């Protein structure tokens, strides 16, 4: 329950999230709260992955492990949802490769307003609203609202013909992500 403090005057600001010993349902959740006095625009996120693990278990596809998570994203000032259940693989492809398929994904669901040209997604708001929204930046800027994340492993229910949680082919599966916050200038360039 513990928040983390990403501070944006910082040459590089990730998170990252072990997913280990997890089974369907399970969720992970991590508040952010950012801190500032440069002129920042957008703060923009990205993810990637790594050092996936079979341990035993069925699967042995990075990317199929990878698809089984899915993560929402809100900023709190009512709370305004940005990413809604979104799957972890195709915000991987769309922020990290600019995939447009995999954007067209996302794109079912998310506000554009929040989607950066370069496929990665902004988290920052004040009040609900992007800085750009707002008619010029006061001679002190408003701190962003705080970030809430929570990334879930879907739970299928499914069953073969043999009566058995075709899901529990990722039983013992394990996988690392990193999130990365780029804060960027008014003209689009990172800080």
């Known amino acids: 329950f513990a928040s983390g403090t990403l ?3 910082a040459k590089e600001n990730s998170a990252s999230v072990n997913l280990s010993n997890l089974k369907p349902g399970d969720k992970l959740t991590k508040d952010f709260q950012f801190e500032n006095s440069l002129a920042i625009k957008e703060v923009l996120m990205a993810l ?10 069925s699967n042995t596809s990075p990317e199929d492990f990878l698809s089984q998570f899915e993560v929402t994203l ?5 709370k305004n949802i940005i990413l809604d259940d979104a799957n972890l693989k195709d ?3 769309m922020s990290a490769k600019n995939d447009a398929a995999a954007a067209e994904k996302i794109k079912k669901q998310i506000d554009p307003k929040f ?3 370069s496929g990665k997604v902004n988290v920052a708001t004040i ?3 992007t800085a750009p929204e707002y008619d010029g930046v006061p001679k002190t800027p408003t701190d962003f609202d705080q970030v809430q994340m929570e990334i879930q492993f879907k739970d299928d229910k ?3 013909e043999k009566g058995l949680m075709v899901q529990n082919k990722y039983q013992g599966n394990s996988i690392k992500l990193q999130f990365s916050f780029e804060a960027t ?7």
């Open 115 to 117: 989607l950066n040209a």
């Open 127 to 129: 009040d609900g609203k």
């Open 7 to 9: 501070d944006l005057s």
């Open 185 to 191: 200038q008014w003209n689009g360039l990172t800080i």
């Open 48 to 57: 990637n992955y790594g050092d996936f693990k079979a341990n035993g278990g």
């Open 158 to 160: 499914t069953k073969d």
């Open 91 to 93: 915000l991987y492809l």
């Open 74 to 78: 809100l900023t709190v000032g009512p």
